[PDB]
Specification:
This protein is mostly helical. The protein contains 5 helices and no strands.
Amino acid sequence: LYTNDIDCGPFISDTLKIDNTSNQLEALVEIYRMMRPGEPPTKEAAETLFGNLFFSAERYDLSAVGRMKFNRRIGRTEIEGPGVLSKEDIIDVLKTL
């Protein structure tokens, strides 16, 4: 366990100590339950909903301005980029936070 206390306070570690969500399927079902409540979740339905909300060129888009600003604010030499949120883009956002 490599960390620090005064700075680098592992808030992310504390967050990882909750929600009892081990399988990626567990995360997907929790997401489909929170976002689309009432209907009991199905693996295919939850996966499709998550993908559509996350990285679909339709139903989600950052303009060139949006992608450039995300790259600049998070820090990145690249100016242009894809219109959808990258898989590691969220990781960079948490890192910045």
